[PDB]
């Protein structure tokens, strides 16, 4: 029901999140950006290379315990 996801930043640091399978991943994006002190819209969050939308859930994306989310600067 809850899984732990590892969010890896551009500098190789990690913040882990415990989320429900039904959680909207906007909440992870907002929390991560808050902790980094950057605007949420300055970042893109990828799972298996694909962009995570605000309304995506772990269940929708097939995420599993200890899966990795990568954070990159938004494209320009």
């Amino acid at each position: 029901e809850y899984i732990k996801l590892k969010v890896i930043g551009q500098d190789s640091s990690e913040i882990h999140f415990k989320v429900k399978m039904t959680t909207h991943l906007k909440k992870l994006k907002e929390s991560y950006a808050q902790r980094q002190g950057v605007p949420m819209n300055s970042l893109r969050f990828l799972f298996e290379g694909q962009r995570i939308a605000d309304n995506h859930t772990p269940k929708e994306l097939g995420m599993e315990e200890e899966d990795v989310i990568e954070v990159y600067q938004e494209q320009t």
Binding site: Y2, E14, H16, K18, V19, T23, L28, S31, R35
Partner: peptide, 9 residues
């Protein structure tokens, strides 16, 4: 860095 785990929802 120390381990950091944040619970959501």
């Amino acid at each position: 860095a120390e381990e950091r785990i944040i619970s959501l929802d």
